[PDB]
Amino acid sequence: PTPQSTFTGPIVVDPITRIEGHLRIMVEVENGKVKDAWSSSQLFRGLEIILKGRDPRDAQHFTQRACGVCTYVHALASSRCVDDAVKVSIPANARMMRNLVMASQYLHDHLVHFYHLHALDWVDVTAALKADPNKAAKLAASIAPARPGNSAKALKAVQDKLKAFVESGQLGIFTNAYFLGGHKAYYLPPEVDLIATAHYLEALHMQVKAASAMAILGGKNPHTQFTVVGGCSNYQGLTKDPLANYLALSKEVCQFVNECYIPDLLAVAGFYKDWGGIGGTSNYLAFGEFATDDSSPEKHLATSQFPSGVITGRDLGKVDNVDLGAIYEDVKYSWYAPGGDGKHPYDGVTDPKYTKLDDKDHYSWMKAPRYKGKAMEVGPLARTFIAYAKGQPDFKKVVDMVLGKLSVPATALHSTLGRTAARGIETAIVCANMEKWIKEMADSGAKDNTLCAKWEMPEESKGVGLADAPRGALSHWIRIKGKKIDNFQLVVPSTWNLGPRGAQGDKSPVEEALIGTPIADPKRPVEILRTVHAFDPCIACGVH
Amino acid sequence: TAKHRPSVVWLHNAECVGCTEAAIRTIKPYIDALILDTISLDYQETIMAAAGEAAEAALHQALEGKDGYYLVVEGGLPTIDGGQWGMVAGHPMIETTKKAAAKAKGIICIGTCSAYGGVQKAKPNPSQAKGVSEALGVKTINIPGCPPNPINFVGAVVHVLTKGIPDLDENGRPKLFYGELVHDNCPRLPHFEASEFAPSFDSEEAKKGFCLYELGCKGPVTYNNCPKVLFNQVNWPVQAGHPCLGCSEPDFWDTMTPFYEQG
Numbered sequence: 069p070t071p072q073s074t075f076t077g078p079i080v081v082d083p084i085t086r087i088e089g090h091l092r093i094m095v096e097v098e099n100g101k102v103k104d105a106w107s108s109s110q111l112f113r114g115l116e117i118i119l120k121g122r123d124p125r126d127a128q129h130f131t132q133r134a135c136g137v138c139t140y141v142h143a144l145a146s147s148r149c150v151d152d153a154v155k156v157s158i159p160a161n162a163r164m165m166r167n168l169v170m171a172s173q174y175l176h177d178h179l180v181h182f183y184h185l186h187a188l189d190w191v192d193v194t195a196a197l198k199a200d201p202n203k204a205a206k207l208a209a210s211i212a213p214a215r216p217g218n219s220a221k222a223l224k225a226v227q228d229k230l231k232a233f234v235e236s237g238q239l240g241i242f243t244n245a246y247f248l249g250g251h252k253a254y255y256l257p258p259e260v261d262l263i264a265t266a267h268y269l270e271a272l273h274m275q276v277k278a279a280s281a282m283a284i285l286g287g288k289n290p291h292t293q294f295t296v297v298g299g300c301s302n303y304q305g306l307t308k309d310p311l312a313n314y315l316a317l318s319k320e321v322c323q324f325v326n327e328c329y330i331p332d333l334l335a336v337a338g339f340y341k342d343w344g345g346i347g348g349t350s351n352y353l354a355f356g357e358f359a360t361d362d363s364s365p366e367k368h369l370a371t372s373q374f375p376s377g378v379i380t381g382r383d384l385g386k387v388d389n390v391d392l393g394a395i396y397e398d399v400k401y402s403w404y405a406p407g408g409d410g411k412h413p414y415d416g417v418t419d420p421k422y423t424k425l426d427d428k429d430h431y432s433w434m435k436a437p438r439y440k441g442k443a444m445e446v447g448p449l450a451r452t453f454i455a456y457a458k459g460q461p462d463f464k465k466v467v468d469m470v471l472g473k474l475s476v477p478a479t480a481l482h483s484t485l486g487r488t489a490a491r492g493i494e495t496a497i498v499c500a501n502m503e504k505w506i507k508e509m510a511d512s513g514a515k516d517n518t519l520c521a522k523w524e525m526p527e528e529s530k531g532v533g534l535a536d537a538p539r540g541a542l543s544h545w546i547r548i549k550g551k552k553i554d555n556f557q558l559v560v561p562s563t564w565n566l567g568p569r570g571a572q573g574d575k576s577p578v579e580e581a582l583i584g585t586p587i588a589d590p591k592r593p594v595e596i597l598r599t600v601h602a603f604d605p606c607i608a609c610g611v612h
Numbered sequence: 613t614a615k616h617r618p619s620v621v622w623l624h625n626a627e628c629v630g631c632t633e634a635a636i637r638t639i640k641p642y643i644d645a646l647i648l649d650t651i652s653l654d655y656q657e658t659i660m661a662a663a664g665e666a667a668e669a670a671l672h673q674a675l676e677g678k679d680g681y682y683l684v685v686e687g688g689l690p691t692i693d694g695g696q697w698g699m700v701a702g703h704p705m706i707e708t709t710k711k712a713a714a715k716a717k718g719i720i721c722i723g724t725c726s727a728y729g730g731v732q733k734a735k736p737n738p739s740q741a742k743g744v745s746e747a748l749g750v751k752t753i754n755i756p757g758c759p760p761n762p763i764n765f766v767g768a769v770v771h772v773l774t775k776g777i778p779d780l781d782e783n784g785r786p787k788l789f790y791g792e793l794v795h796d797n798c799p800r801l802p803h804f805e806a807s808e809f810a811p812s813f814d815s816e817e818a819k820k821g822f823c824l825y826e827l828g829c830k831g832p833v834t835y836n837n838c839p840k841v842l843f844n845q846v847n848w849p850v851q852a853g854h855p856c857l858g859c860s861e862p863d864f865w866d867t868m869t870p871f872y873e874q875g
């Protein structure tokens with residue numbers, strides 16, 4: 069019985085914490101259910117304006133600072149972008165290295181999302197103090213793989229640390245938590261809370277390793293520095309000792325994925341099965357990632373091992389090809405000047421114009437990207453449905469398993485619970501592919517170390533860079549004129565998922581997903597957080 | 613017992629969360645140990661449990677703490693239209709940051725954005741972004757770089773809690789971390805001295821790890837500790853064959869661009 073109050077009226081949550089960037093969410097609620105929703109991004113920076121007239125080689129360095137959480141992916145999309153504009157085909161080794169860095173990014177980003185941003189919506193940290201750590205060890209010994217981190221002794225030591233922390237009276241990041249004093253919408257047993265909390269702390273250490281792995285190829289993290297026009301700069305990344313360290317670190321990260329992330333995810337999902345009926349949307353888009361052929365955008369779309377595709381109306385029998393000319397951005401409900409609706413990104417316009425807070429006619433710094441007039445959800449759930457629908461063997465196996473462990477139908481995936489599970493699903497798949505991808509580059513690198521191709525700056529040209537970033541379909545679009553940036557437009561996964569209504573008044577993915585959200589407690593509306601967080605929002609990515 | 617831990621308020625303004633991310637890569641100590649045993653991190657939008665009014669209230673409790681607090685700012689301040697282009701809780705970021713700064717024991721600017729204005733202040737600066745010290749008119753301890761090494765940031769935090777404000781350069785950077793040129797500690801220095809430069813990234817010279825000065829490297833005019841301490845215990849840009857961008861210098865977006873040139 070999903071808890072739900074009788075509350076009628078507005079709720080505003082601002083800031084939305086545990087996301088990247090600055091989001092205000094407004095809902096109308098009736099009899100304890102969300103009946104309308106607005107996604108209101110509260111910061112503008114204007115990178116696209118900043119880039120006008122600059123060196124196209126410089127773009128990757130500006131755009132990477134769209135975001136520090138999905139670090140890399142913007143530098144990668146810019147490089148693909150400019151590579152496309154100059155018409156250079158990057159060397160095999162460069163494709164491999166760029167793709168492996170993206171893989172390391174998925175691992176790091178997803179692990180931190182589940183534990184450090186998402187989990188506090190489902191896990192009551194204080195209730196962990198009520199567990200018997202012996203009973204919790206027994207519980208962990210009976211669900212998850214055997215590990216010393218899961219022993220009574222380790223769980224007790226976590227409990228003791230947390231205890232002295234709460235008894236200190238300085239709750240720090242837990243101050244005013246929605247779970248303090250219990251909450252109807254939090255269902256977990258104290259033992260589950262304790263296990264998940266132990267893993268939250270472990271994850272804080274494990275993500276350092278994930279970032280180290282990533283840095284071996286990326287040069288540093290956050291904000292990598294190894295991509296150049298025509299390929300990559302990191303010859304050392306092709307060598308044996310660094311690659312063996314990269315593998316070793318990657319396997320430790322993946323052991324923690326398989327040992328802690330997935331089992332915690334599945335326990336959470338098991339207790340909150342009702343969330344498989346909340347927060348669903350209908351259309352899914354992906355440009356794909358991990359391609360065997362990145363010589364062009366077309367080749368990227370065709371040979372992405374996490375396939376590209378478009379699903380409309382939850383129809384898993386008709387995956388359409390991505391039509392890049394069909395993408396456009398509206399601004400009708402955004403803080404931009406009149407007359408900018410319907411713009412393909414090659415013709416994109418970024419002419420900011422603020423009005424006032426909670427102006428229903430203009431309420432976000434995000435543009436509204438649309439695909440033939442339809443809003444599109446992007447990200448792990450989109451990737452998962454598209455891959456599953458095309459019979460991608462890893463996705464089919466893992467998804468069908470998750471479905472089998474949870475005892476729910478594939479249609480239960482069109483939901484916040486689904487969205488959350490998808491994220492972990494593709495994490496286990498990236499993990500299963502790491503050793504193969506690393507061997508491929510180690511072997512290729514040792515035969516020949518070519519890593520960047522020659523290229524020439526054209527007087528005039530356009531190019532597009534595609535990537536499927538941790539949050540979804542990312543595209544960067546350049547017009548070069550006079551060998552300089554004439555226009556540079558970012559269309560980012562969070563723009564797709566979290567932007568405002570389009571020119572037709574049509575709700576974006578998150579706004580639709582929020583409709584019918586139950587609110588057990590209007591003072592502490594965690595359910596709003598559950599669904600918004602499920603999209604893994606990044607407003608800095610979204611608005612740039 | 614119950615040893616009281618110093619209150620830290622962390623604000624996010626016009627930023628990319630890269631500084632927060634960098635901070636949590638600390639291993640001396642790890643971030644868990646730091647917030648359990650060393651400080652009381654009392655507001656931090658990226659990871660705090662509370663949201664909305666609950667979050668706002670936790671901020672205002674931290675600000676009114678009997679014991680005072682230190683202020684950590686990540687990100688520049690957009691000042692156009694009364695600062696309404698950057699808001700939290702329905703308040704301009706300039707206004708909240710101003711209010712938190714008035715009573716801070718100290719202000720630490722984490723990253724180039726907060727310190728000096730950063731990526732949003734780059735021409736033509738549509739949001740009229742400023743750095744903290746400029747926007748507020750107060751002295752800040754600057755921990756720049758885009759983002760800074762967690763060793764620099766945590767070191768500064770620990771240093772200010774246990775010894776005091778550390779010696780600062782002309783740009784407000786602790787001389788402990790920013791006293792030396794990237795270039796002076798670069799393993800490729802002997803290549804530079806012998807005028808052995810890679811002319812492109814595909815060249816055999818690049819393969820042989822020649823100096824990257826001719827490919828825009830700003831090591832010679834950048835103050836940071838990168839080649840000495842590395843990032844993530846493993847690497848730094850030039851080791852990865854890429855010129856320094858000069859990302860710890862004020863306004864580097866405009867002073868160090870074009871990045872692949874020296875002109």
Ligand code: SF4
Binds near residue numbers: 133136726
């Ligand atoms: S200094 Fe760099 S990493 Fe830090 S907030 Fe600014 S753009 Fe992001």
Ligand code: SF4
Binds near residue numbers: 794799
């Ligand atoms: S690569 Fe850069 S920091 Fe190193 S010696 Fe050459 S110019 Fe200096």
Ligand code: FCO
Binds near residue numbers: 138537606
């Ligand atoms: N992943 C990611 Fe960041 C967002 N939204 C980008 O691109």
Ligand code: F3S
Binds near residue numbers: 757834848858859
């Ligand atoms: S770009 Fe920045 S991180 Fe270090 S190497 Fe140069 S100062």
Ligand SMILES: [Mg+2]
Binds near residue numbers: 116
């Ligand atoms: Mg854009």
Ligand code: NI
Binds near residue numbers: 136137
């Ligand atoms: Ni992001």
